[PDB]
Write a protein that binds this ligand. Structure first.
Ligand code: ZN
Ligand code: ZN
Ligand code: ZN
Ligand code: ZN
Lengths: 54, 54
DNA sequence: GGAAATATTATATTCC
DNA sequence: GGAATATAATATTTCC
């Protein structure tokens, strides 16, 4: 239903989607590259980052 | 000095960077996937998309 | 310097 | 269901 981020007002599809959005305001970045120590917000963004390391 | 959008006031690094942004207003999508026919505003985004077909 | 490419990132869309 | 994936758009780096 309405997965409201009660700080920006925006709506989201899942309970995980809104949760992934929460780390915009908090700034968690819970996934770190094994090669360059870069922190990323989502597992998917860290993956596509791994293509600088070819 | 700058290259700011007539329409949303965002400003960009270069002439070419502003042209790319303005495509979000015009809906201009010059980069067309030969497989599925989908269109993209940037050459870079089409090439990422190309790798989704295999 | 500036076009171009690349890296980046927030979030819809996908998929049985 | 909800993680993987694809998208849109901008920011940074590369390249001549
Ligand atoms: Zn929010
Ligand atoms: Zn890395
Ligand atoms: Zn604009
Ligand atoms: Zn395609």
């Amino acid at each position: 239903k309405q997965h409201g981020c009660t700080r920006c007002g925006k709506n989201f599809s899942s309970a995980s989607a809104l949760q992934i959005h929460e780390r915009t305001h908090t700034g968690e970045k819970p996934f770190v590259c094994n090669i360059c120590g870069r922190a990323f917000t989502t597992k998917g963004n860290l993956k596509v980052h791994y293509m600088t390391h070819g």
